C-alpha cells in the first residue's frame, strides 16, 4: 500500500480542488510499464488532522475492492502531503462529461449506468455501503467505460448488521440520500440504490443538477408528499420506471442491486437488438 515518492511524477496543473485538497494527474513507475494516475493531495495548511484519518480510511476501503467498474487504488504516499494514488480515469466525472457532450445517445447512457449497477452489485456483495453515489463520482475511462469513485464516506458493514448507523448528521449529499438516511441516519446498500436512482436521473438529464432550485429540506418535504422528479426529456419510459423503483420510500420494499442490475442488463440487451 505504501508508495515510493521517487517513482511518482506529478504535473503542475490541478484537475480539481476544494476542501479535500487538490487532484493532480501524474505517472507512477510500475514493475515494467509506467501508469497514468490521478493523485488526491491533502490540503496540509488546513491539516485538521481529520483529513489524514479519512484519507487512510478511504485507502483502507479501496484496498479491499477488486472490480472492473470500481476505481483501483495504486497506493498511498507520505511526502509533501498525504497522497492517494489512483489509476487515472481519463475522461473524468460523468456529470461534467455529459454537460459537454449532449450528443451522447440513450443506448450509451444505458450502457454506462448499467456498468455503475454492476460495480454497485459487487459493492453490495462485498457488504460495503458507498454513501456518495452521484454522477460527479462516476468517472469515465472512455465514452463506453464508467467506474465508481470516491470512497470518502464509505463504510465496511459489520458482520452482524445490514446497515451503518451514523451518530451525527455530517456534511452530507442530502439530494442523493434516501428517507431512512435523513430520518434515522441508517445507510444500507438499499440506501445506495436510492442514490443510484438519482444518479440515473442525472445521466439521462445530461449531468443536470437534481431537484434544481431546492434546499435539502424542501427535497425531504417533497419526498414525504410522495412527489418525485419528472422524466428527463428523451429518457426511455423503462429507465424512468427503474428510477421510480429505486425511489421506493420504504427501504424494506426497495430493490437491491442484484434486482436493479438484472433489470438494467435485460433492457440494455433489448436496446442493443434493432
Amino acid at each position: 500500500v505504501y508508495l515510493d515518492r521517487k517513482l511518482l511524477t506529478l504535473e503542475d496543473k490541478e484537475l480539481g480542488s476544494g476542501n479535500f485538497g487538490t487532484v493532480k494527474k501524474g505517472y507512477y513507475q510500475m514493475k515494467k510499464v509506467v501508469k497514468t494516475v490521478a493523485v488526491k493531495i491533502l490540503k496540509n495548511e488546513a491539516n485538521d488532522p481529520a483529513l489524514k484519518d479519512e484519507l487512510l480510511a478511504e485507502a483502507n476501503v479501496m484496498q479491499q475492492l477488486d472490480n472492473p467498474y470500481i476505481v483501483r487504488m495504486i497506493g498511498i504516499c507520505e511526502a509533501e502531503s498525504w497522497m492517494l494514488v489512483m489509476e487515472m480515469a481519463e475522461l473524468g466525472p460523468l456529470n461534467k462529461y455529459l454537460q459537454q457532450n449532449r450528443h451522447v445517445k440513450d443506448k450509451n447512457i444505458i450502457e454506462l449506468v448499467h456498468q455503475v449497477s454492476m460495480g454497485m452489485k459487487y459493492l453490495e456483495e462485498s457488504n460495503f455501503v458507498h454513501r456518495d453515489l452521484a454522477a460527479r463520482n462516476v468517472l469515465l475511462v472512455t465514452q463506453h467505460y464508467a467506474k465508481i469513485s470516491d470512497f470518502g464516506l464509505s463504510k465496511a458493514l459489520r458482520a452482524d448488521e445490514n446497515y451503518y448507523k451514523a451518530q451525527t448528521h455530517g456534511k452530507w449529499p442530502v439530494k442523493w440520500y434516501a428517507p431512512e438516511c435523513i430520518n434515522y441516519y441508517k445507510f444500507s446498500s438499499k440506501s445506495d440504490v436510492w442514490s443510484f436512482g438519482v444518479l440515473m436521473w442525472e445521466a439521462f438529464s445530461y449531468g443536470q443538477k437534481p431537484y434544481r432550485g431546492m434546499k435539502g429540506s424542501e427535497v425531504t418535504a417533497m419526498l414525504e408528499k410522495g412527489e418525485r422528479m419528472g422524466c428527463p426529456a428523451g429518457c426511455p419510459r423503462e429507465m424512468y420506471d427503474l428510477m421510480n423503483l429505486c425511489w421506493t420510500y420504504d427501504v424494506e420494499n426497495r430493490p437491491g442491486f442484484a434486482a436493479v442490475e438484472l433489470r438494467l442488463r435485460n433492457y440494455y440487451y433489448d436496446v442493443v437488438n434493432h
Binding site: 452521484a134 456534511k171 449529499p173 439530494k175 434546499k215 435539502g216
Partner: peptide, 5 residues
C-alpha cells in the same frame, strides 16, 4: 449546494 450540514 451539494454537501449540506
Amino acid at each position: 449546494e451539494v454537501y449540506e450540514s
